[PDB]
Design a protein around this motif. Structure first.
Motif, PDB file in Angstrom:
ATOM      1  N   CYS A  91      12.619  46.107   4.116  1.00  0.00           N
ATOM      2  CA  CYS A  91      13.431  45.950   2.909  1.00  0.00           C
ATOM      3  C   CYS A  91      12.672  46.082   1.591  1.00  0.00           C
ATOM      4  O   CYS A  91      13.293  46.292   0.547  1.00  0.00           O
ATOM      5  CB  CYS A  91      14.164  44.612   2.924  1.00  0.00           C
ATOM      6  SG  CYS A  91      15.478  44.539   4.124  1.00  0.00           S
ATOM      7  N   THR A  92      11.349  45.948   1.624  1.00  0.00           N
ATOM      8  CA  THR A  92      10.598  45.875   0.369  1.00  0.00           C
ATOM      9  C   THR A  92       9.351  46.755   0.282  1.00  0.00           C
ATOM     10  O   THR A  92       8.815  46.956  -0.810  1.00  0.00           O
ATOM     11  CB  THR A  92      10.196  44.418   0.029  1.00  0.00           C
ATOM     12  OG1 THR A  92       9.312  43.914   1.036  1.00  0.00           O
ATOM     13  CG2 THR A  92      11.425  43.533  -0.060  1.00  0.00           C
ATOM     14  N   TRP A 129      21.350  40.771   8.602  1.00  0.00           N
ATOM     15  CA  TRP A 129      20.537  41.637   7.758  1.00  0.00           C
ATOM     16  C   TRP A 129      20.556  43.091   8.225  1.00  0.00           C
ATOM     17  O   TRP A 129      19.894  43.934   7.632  1.00  0.00           O
ATOM     18  CB  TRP A 129      19.084  41.138   7.723  1.00  0.00           C
ATOM     19  CG  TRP A 129      18.865  39.932   6.839  1.00  0.00           C
ATOM     20  CD1 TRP A 129      19.597  38.779   6.820  1.00  0.00           C
ATOM     21  CD2 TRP A 129      17.818  39.760   5.878  1.00  0.00           C
ATOM     22  NE1 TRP A 129      19.086  37.910   5.876  1.00  0.00           N
ATOM     23  CE2 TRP A 129      17.988  38.490   5.292  1.00  0.00           C
ATOM     24  CE3 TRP A 129      16.756  40.564   5.448  1.00  0.00           C
ATOM     25  CZ2 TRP A 129      17.128  37.999   4.303  1.00  0.00           C
ATOM     26  CZ3 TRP A 129      15.901  40.074   4.466  1.00  0.00           C
ATOM     27  CH2 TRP A 129      16.099  38.806   3.903  1.00  0.00           C
ATOM     28  N   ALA A 145      21.207  45.918   5.795  1.00  0.00           N
ATOM     29  CA  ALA A 145      20.061  46.050   4.911  1.00  0.00           C
ATOM     30  C   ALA A 145      18.934  46.816   5.610  1.00  0.00           C
ATOM     31  O   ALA A 145      18.390  47.764   5.045  1.00  0.00           O
ATOM     32  CB  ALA A 145      19.574  44.665   4.427  1.00  0.00           C
ATOM     33  N   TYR A 146      18.588  46.418   6.838  1.00  0.00           N
ATOM     34  CA  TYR A 146      17.534  47.116   7.583  1.00  0.00           C
ATOM     35  C   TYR A 146      17.871  48.597   7.780  1.00  0.00           C
ATOM     36  O   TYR A 146      17.014  49.468   7.616  1.00  0.00           O
ATOM     37  CB  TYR A 146      17.321  46.491   8.965  1.00  0.00           C
ATOM     38  CG  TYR A 146      16.903  45.037   8.972  1.00  0.00           C
ATOM     39  CD1 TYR A 146      16.171  44.494   7.926  1.00  0.00           C
ATOM     40  CD2 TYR A 146      17.248  44.209  10.032  1.00  0.00           C
ATOM     41  CE1 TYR A 146      15.781  43.154   7.944  1.00  0.00           C
ATOM     42  CE2 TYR A 146      16.870  42.882  10.058  1.00  0.00           C
ATOM     43  CZ  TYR A 146      16.140  42.360   9.021  1.00  0.00           C
ATOM     44  OH  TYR A 146      15.769  41.032   9.053  1.00  0.00           O
ATOM     45  N   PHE A 166      18.013  50.434   4.089  1.00  0.00           N
ATOM     46  CA  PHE A 166      16.747  50.521   3.370  1.00  0.00           C
ATOM     47  C   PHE A 166      15.673  51.166   4.229  1.00  0.00           C
ATOM     48  O   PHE A 166      14.724  51.759   3.716  1.00  0.00           O
ATOM     49  CB  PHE A 166      16.321  49.144   2.846  1.00  0.00           C
ATOM     50  CG  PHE A 166      17.333  48.522   1.933  1.00  0.00           C
ATOM     51  CD1 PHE A 166      17.846  49.239   0.862  1.00  0.00           C
ATOM     52  CD2 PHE A 166      17.803  47.241   2.159  1.00  0.00           C
ATOM     53  CE1 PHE A 166      18.802  48.683   0.027  1.00  0.00           C
ATOM     54  CE2 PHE A 166      18.754  46.679   1.328  1.00  0.00           C
ATOM     55  CZ  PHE A 166      19.254  47.401   0.262  1.00  0.00           C
ATOM     56  N   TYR A 224      23.592  42.669   2.390  1.00  0.00           N
ATOM     57  CA  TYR A 224      23.170  43.982   1.912  1.00  0.00           C
ATOM     58  C   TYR A 224      23.222  44.076   0.385  1.00  0.00           C
ATOM     59  O   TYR A 224      22.286  44.569  -0.246  1.00  0.00           O
ATOM     60  CB  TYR A 224      24.032  45.075   2.551  1.00  0.00           C
ATOM     61  CG  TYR A 224      23.928  46.410   1.854  1.00  0.00           C
ATOM     62  CD1 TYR A 224      22.758  47.155   1.911  1.00  0.00           C
ATOM     63  CD2 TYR A 224      24.997  46.913   1.130  1.00  0.00           C
ATOM     64  CE1 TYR A 224      22.657  48.381   1.268  1.00  0.00           C
ATOM     65  CE2 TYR A 224      24.910  48.128   0.487  1.00  0.00           C
ATOM     66  CZ  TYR A 224      23.743  48.856   0.557  1.00  0.00           C
ATOM     67  OH  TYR A 224      23.668  50.065  -0.088  1.00  0.00           O
ATOM     68  N   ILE A 247      20.398  41.949  -1.139  1.00  0.00           N
ATOM     69  CA  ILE A 247      19.067  42.545  -1.026  1.00  0.00           C
ATOM     70  C   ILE A 247      18.943  43.797  -1.900  1.00  0.00           C
ATOM     71  O   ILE A 247      17.906  44.034  -2.504  1.00  0.00           O
ATOM     72  CB  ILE A 247      18.717  42.870   0.435  1.00  0.00           C
ATOM     73  CG1 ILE A 247      18.671  41.571   1.248  1.00  0.00           C
ATOM     74  CG2 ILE A 247      17.364  43.594   0.531  1.00  0.00           C
ATOM     75  CD1 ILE A 247      17.578  40.616   0.795  1.00  0.00           C
ATOM     76  N   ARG A 295      16.008  44.158  -4.624  1.00  0.00           N
ATOM     77  CA  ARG A 295      15.130  45.314  -4.655  1.00  0.00           C
ATOM     78  C   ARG A 295      15.105  45.877  -6.059  1.00  0.00           C
ATOM     79  O   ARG A 295      14.036  46.190  -6.594  1.00  0.00           O
ATOM     80  CB  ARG A 295      15.603  46.381  -3.669  1.00  0.00           C
ATOM     81  CG  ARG A 295      15.434  45.976  -2.218  1.00  0.00           C
ATOM     82  CD  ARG A 295      15.944  47.048  -1.272  1.00  0.00           C
ATOM     83  NE  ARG A 295      14.865  47.909  -0.797  1.00  0.00           N
ATOM     84  CZ  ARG A 295      14.814  49.219  -0.991  1.00  0.00           C
ATOM     85  NH1 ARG A 295      15.786  49.830  -1.653  1.00  0.00           N
ATOM     86  NH2 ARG A 295      13.794  49.919  -0.520  1.00  0.00           N
TER      87      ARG A 295
END
Ligand SMILES: N[C@@H](CCC(=O)N[C@@H](CSCc1ccc([N+](=O)[O-])cc1)C(=O)NCC(=O)O)C(=O)O
Ligand SMILES: N[C@@H](CCC(=O)N[C@@H](CSCc1ccc([N+](=O)[O-])cc1)C(=O)NCC(=O)O)C(=O)O
Ligand SMILES: O=[N+](O)c1ccc(CS)cc1
Ligand SMILES: O=[N+](O)c1ccc(CS)cc1
Ligand SMILES: O=[N+](O)c1ccc(CS)cc1
Lengths: 217, 219
Positions: free
Chosen positions: B114-115, B163, B166-167, B170, B206, B209, B213
């Motif tokens: 995610c980052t 999550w 999001a995974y 991203f 989502y 996050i 981000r």
């Protein structure tokens, strides 16, 4: 009933399991592993992590030192209880063993291997951790109270690394944390501990060689 | 209930979700308190002075920190219904082993997806899928990791499903393609009231996050 322990002599994690077994009076075979040349047995018993210690009970493996100690507590539950019976006290014992697990080995390794500012921060945090642990001990004989408990077992093996920490980290733990050192020596008065732990000199020498072989110093 | 049960938590935290599920599975009505991690409450700092993290379960005024330790505490205190751990010591050790594996792998790999950027990110994507596949292998053909009923590993792991959008977005992953059995398992879990009531929607996590981000200058 077969009990086997796959281990590596200077491993604090393995020492935990050694102590738990001895404290319960469980006879077992200790098998030394070469971590540069892991045995087929080790690879079969711990395929996920490929690490020691591995406790093998009647051919079935229990990996992760503190999980193995809890297994020992739950299977040989006739005497010498390593965890309290009260749920809240048990949660606290687990919390502090978890704290040890997260902090001590890693901070110590950084003390023995890192350099510069990372090393300095590791030293600071290490002493802070010992002090927090001293506070938790209070005026009890052991973390377990009047008898060795889960936290004592989790923590005391790191005492064998203290000469290494002090030499390579230029620390004097004895003068900074005398309560801690006195506690460790009390544990070392117990046969189950004494016979499970190598001397600080042997570990210091091992780590010295390790550094020299890693191109540190 | 004479007991006071309070949970200090942060809504998208997978760790807090574990404790929410555990409480719900026991049918325990509790007070949930939302924490701003950028403005931690005096209560949070008092109850978790060591880590200053959520979740913190407070039972009759006493704090239990560390999500899995809290779940075990809930299991031991409310031990007259829906057991979350096996009775056999060896099976218990295995359940603990796999919960530990989840604790060591999933959150951090997901955070990197995610980052992070570049090679770190690609590496984390690979390790993440590898971990899910290992867990899938452990699940086998069982309904839950705990067997016919939700267990300790299910509780440890299913919060990460929230999550997944999001995974996937991203990280440019299709987890259902890689790990269909895993996704089917998570959906089964989400059909249980105790789990559904405890977990935020994937879309909401989502959006959260995505915004984070942006604030961190990540893209
Ligand atoms: N979480 C585990 C940690 C156990 C662990 O770290 N085991 C180490 C040995 S003790 C720590 C350690 C590691 C390495 C050295 N060394 O001198 O190279 C010394 C000590 C290991 O088996 N490593 C195998 C591998 O990764 O290949 C537990 O609690 O059981
Ligand atoms: N080992 C602990 C881990 C708990 C934990 O990581 N808590 C985090 C929140 S969940 C992980 C998390 C963090 C941040 C975001 N975010 O979106 O900003 C999301 C999730 C926390 O309190 N952090 C406070 C701090 O470190 O100061 C447990 O299992 O309970
Ligand atoms: O000195 N040390 O604590 C130490 C050095 C190197 C390793 C191998 S990862 C492990 C431990
Ligand atoms: O996207 N993330 O998983 C994530 C981002 C930022 C933080 C806090 S530094 C924690 C988690
Ligand atoms: O979906 N959620 O993030 C969430 C679920 C349940 C509670 C407890 S009121 C708080 C948050």
């Amino acid at each position: 009933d077969e009990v086997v322990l796959l281990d590596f002599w200077p491993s604090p994690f393995g020492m935990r399991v050694r102590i738990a077994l001895a404290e319960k009076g469980i006879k077992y075979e200790y098998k030394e592993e070469d971590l540069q040349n892991k045995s087929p047995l080790l690879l079969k018993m711990n395929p996920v992590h490929k690490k020691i210690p591995v406790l093998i009970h009647n051919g079935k493996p229990i990996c992760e030192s503190l999980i193995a100690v809890q297994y020992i507590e739950e299977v040989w539950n006739d005497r010498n209880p390593l965890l309290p019976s009260d749920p809240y006290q048990r949660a606290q014992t687990r919390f502090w063993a978890d704290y040890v697990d997260k902090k001590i080995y890693d901070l110590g390794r950084k003390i023995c291997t890192s350099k510069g500012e990372e090393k300095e921060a590791a030293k600071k945090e290490f002493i802070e951790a010992l002090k927090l642990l001293e506070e938790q001990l209070g005026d009890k004989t052991y973390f377990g109270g009047d008898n060795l408990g889960f936290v004592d077992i989790a923590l005391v093996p790191f005492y064998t690394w203290f000469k290494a920490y002090e030499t390579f980290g230029t620390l004097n733990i004895e003068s900074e944390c005398p309560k801690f050192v006195a506690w460790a020596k009390r544990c070392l008065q117990k046969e189950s501990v004494a016979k499970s732990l190598p001397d600080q000199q042997k570990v210091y020498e091992f780590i010295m060689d390790l550094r020299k072989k890693l191109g540190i110093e």
